[PDB]
Subunit: 188 residues, 4 copies
């Protein structure tokens, strides 16, 4: 493939990700106002749980939340059922990330988290998913297709969740009057 065609191939995949993000910005985002309220009410930490590519995005979001004034950390969904559920305490709010909302590792956390009683938020592509139905607050972040020809590799979905989560973090930060000095305290 010549250089101009290689460049056009790269831009094609980028453009597929851009379109997925546009789709979300153009949607009503009705449950987001409730999402902000629940997160503002959190007296503990916002605990993000995920596995696979969603799990790496969940790690970035926990870091971004914390660095911008919303105490947060990540628990890997497998490690959760090997003891790390002990990291979650009564005042913590839990955000579980799964694009399908069927990921077996994430569903496996739910019987314990129901017993523990924490408020559960899901980020998935469908309010009808198993995970979304089991949570207290389902946030639907629809994603039509992944960027590859067979639609198999998380690319549109992981990017959309990252953009949505970053914006939620920055809104919480602005609303709580987080300052340059507070940013400097955590990033010296």
């Amino acid at each position: 493939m010549n250089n101009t065609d290689l460049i056009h191939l790269i831009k094609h995949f980028m453009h597929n990700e851009l379109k997925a993000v546009e789709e979300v910005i153009d949607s009503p985002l009705s449950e987001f106002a409730n999402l902000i309220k629940v997160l503002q009410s959190c007296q503990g930490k916002v605990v993000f749980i995920g596995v696979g590519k969603s799990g790496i995005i969940a790690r970035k979001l926990a870091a971004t939340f914390a660095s911008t004034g919303t105490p947060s950390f990540f628990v890997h969904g497998t490690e959760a059922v090997h003891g790390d559920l002990g990291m979650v305490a009564k005042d913590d709010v839990v955000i579980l990330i799964s694009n399908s909302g069927e990921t077996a590792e994430i569903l496996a956390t739910l019987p314990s988290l129901k017993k523990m009683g924490n408020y559960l938020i899901s980020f998935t592509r469908s309010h009808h998913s198993s995970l979304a139905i089991s949570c207290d607050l389902s946030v639907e972040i629809p994603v039509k297709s992944e960027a590859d020809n067979l639609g198999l590799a998380p690319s549109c979905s992981s990017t959309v969740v990252l953009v949505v989560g970053d914006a939620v973090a920055l809104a919480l930060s602005e609303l709580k009057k987080f300052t340059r000095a507070d940013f400097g305290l955590y990033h010296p």
Copy 2:
């Protein structure tokens, strides 16, 4: 803040990220053809090195490369200088991610990596940065501003690097004729 204003605030941050991605898709991406060639020539693993938010994106990109047929793994930039440079062997190609190209932890890897002799690629916002000048192939991914009012929190920059890296992965994958069956082997 009422519900419609909270929603508009969230969409504002999302839109700032969208614009940064658009800026990159609209640019020439001249060095990308060379980037693809170097990565296709790799007989070892593509080793991604980063710290902070770039480092979490570098972890996602290594996973995406591997899952789509380009053997790759992540080495945290601090851990690298505590021994993990031993993970990098002669045939490995190294991609070092730093938005400023001045991150002290990333620069600290360079005297050893020069002695080790591996081909070094940087992803930074400026060909003039310290990191870009020390690498064999500098890839410039400019980012005008972060999405927050003070421009302090990686949001536009981490998202742009993610989109660019995903597209590079998917192009390498398509070019090497990676199949549904190969995807299934690594994702059973």
Copy 3:
């Protein structure tokens, strides 16, 4: 080297680690009673901070604490100064692990943690170290030599810290009357 000599070489390194652990069990452990008291008083999470090999042991200890009824999580020492200090909130107690007590990344956390006001505990080989002197409670875990001929590779030191930390976790667990049913809740 023949098989019997290879086996004796492996046992030699194992034996060097065993001796370092014995040295600690034979010591007074005077400050451990105070350590238990501080950890029992924690109303938040026990936050472990480390980098390099100490950092991986710190990750294991945070998991072991949590799985046995003491809410705890790990913050990497570099990531801490890139924003993750925002994970630590007023009621959290911090354990910083550094064998020398001079590790630059760990010392770099201290000006912010002093401003944030949390009670700081160090695990180091010397009460005279920079880290130990800056903390509220210094726990000295002396280690004479690493297991390799040049004494360079953390082996005796990382193992000793692991054994000491596991025992502290299991004592807190027994003292708080942690049950089989609670273990099952976090490990379903």
Copy 4:
């Protein structure tokens, strides 16, 4: 509990870990000579796979191997079946760590790894375990009991695996004539 009794309680758990290590040093370690030979023959990377507490020890061992001259990295057992199996290439040797040798996440890697053809080594408590029987080389590291009263928390088992793995790393390092200068290259 008074101070002298708290100290004796801590030393009791430490002593339980010490005894488990002694049990192993006193055993024949027959398959270790073969283990060294296979690891010396590796032309690629030694890839450690684990989850839970074994997985954190597997992360420490990969780092220790690399820092002492045996290129190695860690792949989490869950992430492996979400794509990270793509990190393992034909010349890589795989060490899978599971104390029971029945851990579901670790067994789930095996159909793909059999198709991929890599030489598989297991570290488990029993040659009869599912994992041990599926591997090319089973290394049995027996552990009678964990250190807690109910024998539930990995403590003796994770410590024994750490000591055994450190010694294997240091033996490979000595045998290949790894130097102070090479240590300094990876740890500058």
